[PDB]
Write a structure and sequence with these properties.
Length: 437
RNA sequence: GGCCCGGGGCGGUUCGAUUCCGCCCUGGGCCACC
């Protein structure tokens, strides 16, 4: 188990099995013939065209090249039309840029429309840079695609491989830039231990300089941060993972971490031991794309957590879970119950203009003097975290995300105790409380 | 849809709000869906 050896066994986990390779080639060729029959301009790109797709994550990306002059509406209608007559079956679901996902002879295919530009300067559709990335990458990644897969399986096996809002990790494209820059998976991990939240990797200039935030500048467009959606906490989890791996080189870093099957009974006893307040906000899942849902779930979660902290329920952490039916906003606090009364800080005895206005308010306890200023005893309209959330959510639904918020406006409940462990959140709850074993 | 920066109208809470909780407009970026 000496790094170097562990990487030899690892390839067996990230390199695609010759059967899968054929399957993909067999499909790519078919895809070609179907599109030629239509005689449309296209180009294969991504993991497949560069043969750097992670074993088991096969998916072809065909790109329909359209004239800069065409409407975005024209791309949507023409694009989807073509992709539909080209796939065995399809599925159309996207957040902003229209494309068709489907299957041809078994492999997953992404038929995406985009404008054929000259220079990836001022892109007109969200994806216009991909083809230029392919040209920039095909000549330089050649011979190091296995190195890309180690990295991809590494990030994947540790939950930070995707770059979409659900993951907020490293994009496949980022992975390939890191390899072209550092030269290998090992070199990347060796240096990633020294990355900070200000590290700027400039592939084009071949340099690493300190900056504002973590910025991996695109060879294709200097104003573009390739690691733009990589959360701070994930950059941290990676760096830390790189440090551990170099010290305890084990091929467990490439294996999909434990499935975790904890007993809903073991959990309840832990909560009892923690003596904290744990509960979720349950509402119906909005029929919308993951890329729209999660940012909203992060917002609702945060907006409620922030309410709980300023209201003194001493929040610990929050997490969210979205099943196919509902969504869950999870919380844990330190104050299961607070008092009715609390102090409110008034003016200093000095200026009376305000001292008087302060004491004029009909209070139930009569204000007192402490250290130079007046204080008042006030009563809260709720004494538990649940009560607070119930009030808050019912009253601030609109602010908890456009879609999430509207749903909560039409329904939401607060689950606690046993009734909460029956729900599909026992996995996120453990993760939240740092329960080990 | 989310984030960031800026204009203008407001409501609530507070002795005291541009400054705390929010609501309408509105201008410009950026990100995720490839």
């Amino acid at each position: 188990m000496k790094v170097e050896e562990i990487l030899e066994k690892a390839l067996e986990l990230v390199i695609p099995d010759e059967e899968e390779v054929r399957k993909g080639r067999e499909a790519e060729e078919e895809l070609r013939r179907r599109l030629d029959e239509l005689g449309v301009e296209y180009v294969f790109v991504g993991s497949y065209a560069r043969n750097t797709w992670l074993k088991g994550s096969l998916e072809i990306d065909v790109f329909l090249l359209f004239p800069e002059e065409f409407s975005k509406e024209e791309l949507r209608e023409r694009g989807l039309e073509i992709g539909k007559a080209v796939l065995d079956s399809y599925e159309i679901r996207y957040a902003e840029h229209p494309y068709v996902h489907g299957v041809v002879k078994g492999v997953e295919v992404d038929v995406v429309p985009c404008y054929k530009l000259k220079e990836p300067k001022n892109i007109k559709s969200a994806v216009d840079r991909t083809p230029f990335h392919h040209k920039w990458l095909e000549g330089r990644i050649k011979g190091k695609e296995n190195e890309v897969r180690l990295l991809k399986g590494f990030l994947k096996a540790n939950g930070i491989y995707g770059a979409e809002y659900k993951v907020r990790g490293f994009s496949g494209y980022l992975c390939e830039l890191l390899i072209v820059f550092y030269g290998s998976f090992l070199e990347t991990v060796k240096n990633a231990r020294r990355w900070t939240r200000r590290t700027v990797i400039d592939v084009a200039k071949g340099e690493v300089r300190k900056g504002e935030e973590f910025f991996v500048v695109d060879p294709v467009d200097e104003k573009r941060n390739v690691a733009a959606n990589l959360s701070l906490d994930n950059l941290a989890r990676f760096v830390h993972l790189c440090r551990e791996f170099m010290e305890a080189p084990s091929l467990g870093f490439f294996k999909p971490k434990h499935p975790l099957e904890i007993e809903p009974e073991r959990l309840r006893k832990i909560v009892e031991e923690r003596g904290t307040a744990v509960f979720a906000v349950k509402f119906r899942k909005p029929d919308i794309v993951d890329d729209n849902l999660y940012p909203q779930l992060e917002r609702a979660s945060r907006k409620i957590f922030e309410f709980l902290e300023r209201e003194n329920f001493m929040p610990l952490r929050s997490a969210f879970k979205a099943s196919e039916e509902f969504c869950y906003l999870l919380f844990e606090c330190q104050i299961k119950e607070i008092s009715r009364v609390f102090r409110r800080m008034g003016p200093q005895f000095e200026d009376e203009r305000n001292v008087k206005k302060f004491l004029s308010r009909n209070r139930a306890f009569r204000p007192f003097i402490e250290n130079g200023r007046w204080w008042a005893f006030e009563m809260r309209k709720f004494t538990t975290p649940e009560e607070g959330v119930r009030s808050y959510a019912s009253t601030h639904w609109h602010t908890l995300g456009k879609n999430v918020g509207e749903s909560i406006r039409e329904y939401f409940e607060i689950i606690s105790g046993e009734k909460l462990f029956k729900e599909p959140v026992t996995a996120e709850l453990c993760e939240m409380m740092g329960v080990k074993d």
